[PDB]
Each structure stands twice: as structure tokens, then as C-alpha cells.
């Protein structure tokens, strides 16, 4: 499907396969938000570890959906950014404060267990 099915213990856990287009990523923002409407979770975990290339057009969407789902009412971490994509993501001039990027998926939920439910 490209999008996963996602539900995990008063949080969420969304994975992302290898993708290249912004015809997938436009509905993908609605595919993430429509779950967090019905499922009332106080934080998602987006994982972009499998990707090796994100263009400057698609980097707006992942540069938005962190700020989008915060406005919905859930914190957003982004886990496992590759070194190739993390260089070219800066050329999209970010103001990333509120990203809370962990290193891998195992230490990712240890951060949202610290934020949610102390």
C-alpha cells in the first residue's frame, strides 16, 4: 500500500518504505491524519530509515507534517534519518525546533515514554 497499518499502545508507529514521488506523499499526509482523528494518540513515530533520496519538493511535506500533527494534538518524532538525505534536507532551509529526532526505532519510543506518561 505504501502507507502502513499502525497502532501501538497509546502511541502510534508508522513506517515508510522506499518511495520517490510527491503523488504518494500528498495523500500520505491525509493517510496519517485520518488515523489520528479516530485513534486518539498523543504522539506518532515516523520512520524514514529505508529511504535514500528525498527531493526538495517532497521535503516540504515531511517538513510540514511534523508541524501539522502538532496542531492536531500529538508530538512528532522522526527516527533514523540517513546521512545522504540529511545533507540535502538542510538546503530546504529549516527552522526545526520540535522535531525530537531519535537515532533508531528502539530508542524512539523511550523518548515518547518520557514525554507521554511520566
Amino acid at each position: 500500500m505504501g502507507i502502513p497499518i499502525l497502532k501501538l499502545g497509546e502511541c502510534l508507529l508508522i513506517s515508510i518504505q522506499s518511495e520517490l514521488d510527491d503523488h504518494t506523499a500528498v495523500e500520505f499526509q491525509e493517510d496519517l491524519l485520518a488515523k489520528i482523528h479516530e485513534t486518539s494518540a498523543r504522539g506518532v513515530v515516523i520512520d524514514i530509515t529505508s529511504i535514500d533520496f528525498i527531493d526538495s519538493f517532497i521535503a516540504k511535506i515531511l517538513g510540514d507534517v511534523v508541524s501539522m500533527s502538532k496542531l492536531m494534538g500529538a508530538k512528532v518524532v522522526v527516527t533514523g534519518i540517513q546521512p545522504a538525505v540529511a545533507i540535502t534536507l538542510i538546503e530546504l532551509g529549516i527552522t526545526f525546533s520540535g522535531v525530537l529526532s531519535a537515532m533508531d526505532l528502539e530508542s524512539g519510543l523511550e523518548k515518547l515514554k518520557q514525554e507521554l506518561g511520566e
Binding site: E30, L33, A34, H37, M68, L71, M72, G73, A74
Partner: protein, 115 residues
């Protein structure tokens, strides 16, 4: 008539926004800020859980969620929608539902509910 809504539990004071997605209703600002000093209302919830889409001029709504902070404590916009967050040509506390925004409202004024 044209009169939207106002409630008052008075330790906070919150409100409900119905479906009037037109820019001609500036009165939802001017019916809120009149009572913000006529009673001692600390924190408030806009609670726009029922709505369809904003036109494109939300500065009657996303700026009145700033000038409440000039008069009093903050604002806790509850329950944005799918097409609502999907457009942002434009911060705030913005929790999820009404049953948890009231929990942090007492928590930001040092109260809680157990028995």
C-alpha cells in the same frame, strides 16, 4: 439571530464554535473578549471540534488565540479537522479532544481530579 455561544464554569471559561465558516462573523471575537475582564477568566478553550474549513483568513481566529494571552492566560484550541490542518498558508497549545484539554487547564492552574 446571530449569537454563537458562551459558557462559564468560571475557574476556566470556555466556549463552543459552531459551523459558521464565514469571515463576516467577527462577533465571535467581540463576544469573547467582553467577558474576559467582566469575569476573572484565567484560561480558555476555543473547542472548535465541529467545523468544515476556514476560508483562508484565519487571523480572526488564530490571532484571537494570541490576544487572549494579552488579557489572560493561554488558549487550548480543541479538535482540528482533516482539511483544516491540510492547508496552512500561515505557537499555541492545541490539544486533541475536550476531555483532556480540561485536564491540562487545571494542571496549568495547579489542580486535578481524583477520588
Amino acid at each position: 439571530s446571530a449569537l454563537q455561544e458562551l459558557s462559564a464554569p468560571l475557574l476556566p471559561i470556555f466556549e463552543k464554535i459552531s459551523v459558521m465558516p464565514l469571515i463576516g462573523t467577527i462577533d465571535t471575537e467581540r463576544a469573547k473578549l467582553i467577558i474576559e475582564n467582566l469575569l476573572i477568566g484565567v484560561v480558555k478553550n476555543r473547542s472548535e471540534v465541529v467545523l468544515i474549513d476556514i476560508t483562508g483568513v484565519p487571523v480572526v481566529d488564530t490571532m484571537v488565540a494570541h490576544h487572549i494571552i494579552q488579557a489572560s492566560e493561554a488558549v487550548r484550541l480543541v479538535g482540528c479537522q482533516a482539511m483544516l490542518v491540510g492547508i496552512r498558508p500561515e505557537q499555541i497549545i492545541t490539544t486533541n479532544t475536550m476531555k483532556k484539554g480540561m485536564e491540562r487547564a487545571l494542571a496549568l492552574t495547579n489542580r486535578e481530579i481524583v477520588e
